[model samples]
Target: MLKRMYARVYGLVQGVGFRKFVQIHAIRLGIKGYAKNLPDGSVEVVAEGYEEALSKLLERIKQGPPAAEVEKVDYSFSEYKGEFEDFETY
Candidate 1:
């Protein structure tokens, strides 16, 4: 089943290549979504994929790139809407 994971990554995320990191992982995990930076210095990621894919992405999101501090990660699982066709950084 397709599912959605709405995640907010905090701490040393912006300007740290975190978005690109996410995009890479999302693609490798076969997820469809976008990872973008917020004004609050956080990153917002919305991804839709299978349970295993979601799990893989979540673990990567939590770890982030080596440059990322990854102090915290908040995410929620919800119904999949099939709105995104690809994983992108926007």
Candidate 2:
């Protein structure tokens, strides 16, 4: 089933190609939405896709790229909103 996921990743997520990493995985997983840098030095990801794919993406986010020192992740799911046609990073 399709769903929406809103997630926040903390610690060393910006300036380390984290958003691009997220974009790569999200596109690979066939997920759509966006990953953006927050003012609080965290990364915010909003995605919509199959539940399984979302789970996979979440796991990748936890690990992040080699340069990103992922300290914590907070996430939740909701009904899919069909708001995006492609994944993006900002």
Candidate 3:
């Protein structure tokens, strides 16, 4: 069954390759959704995929990329919303 995740990651996320890293991982995990920068210097991710795939993606997000120093990652799980055809970053 498909599922969805809403994630907020904190720390040195902006001006880093965090969003690109997220899109690459999401593509590898076969997930669909988007990643964006928040005004509070955090990153927001909304994705839908298999639970296992999402888990892997979240794990990567928690540790961000070398340029990104993540402090915390919070997520909420839910049903797949079918709102996206592919993963993207903004």
Give the CA lDDT, 0 to 100, for residue 71 in model 1.
Answer: 94
lDDT of 3 at 13: 92
Using TM-score, give the best candidate's number: 2
**lDDT of each residue in 24-74, candidate 3, tens digit only:** 999998999999999999999999999999999999999989989999999
lDDT of 3: 0.95
Over 1-90, each residue of candidate 1 has an lDDT whose tens digit, in order, gives 889999999999887889999999999988999999988999999999998899999999999999999999999999999999999996
* Runs in model 2 lying further than 4 Å from the true structure: none
Q: Residue 78 error for model 1, in Å? A: 0.3
- lDDT for predicted candidate 2 compared with the true structure: 0.97
Top candidate (lDDT)? 2
Candidate 2 per-residue lDDT over residues 1-90, each given as its tens digit: 999999999998899999999999999999999999999999999999999999999999998999999999999999999999999988
TM-scores, all candidates, are 0.97, 0.98, 0.97
Model 1 stretches with alpha carbons more than 4 Å out: none
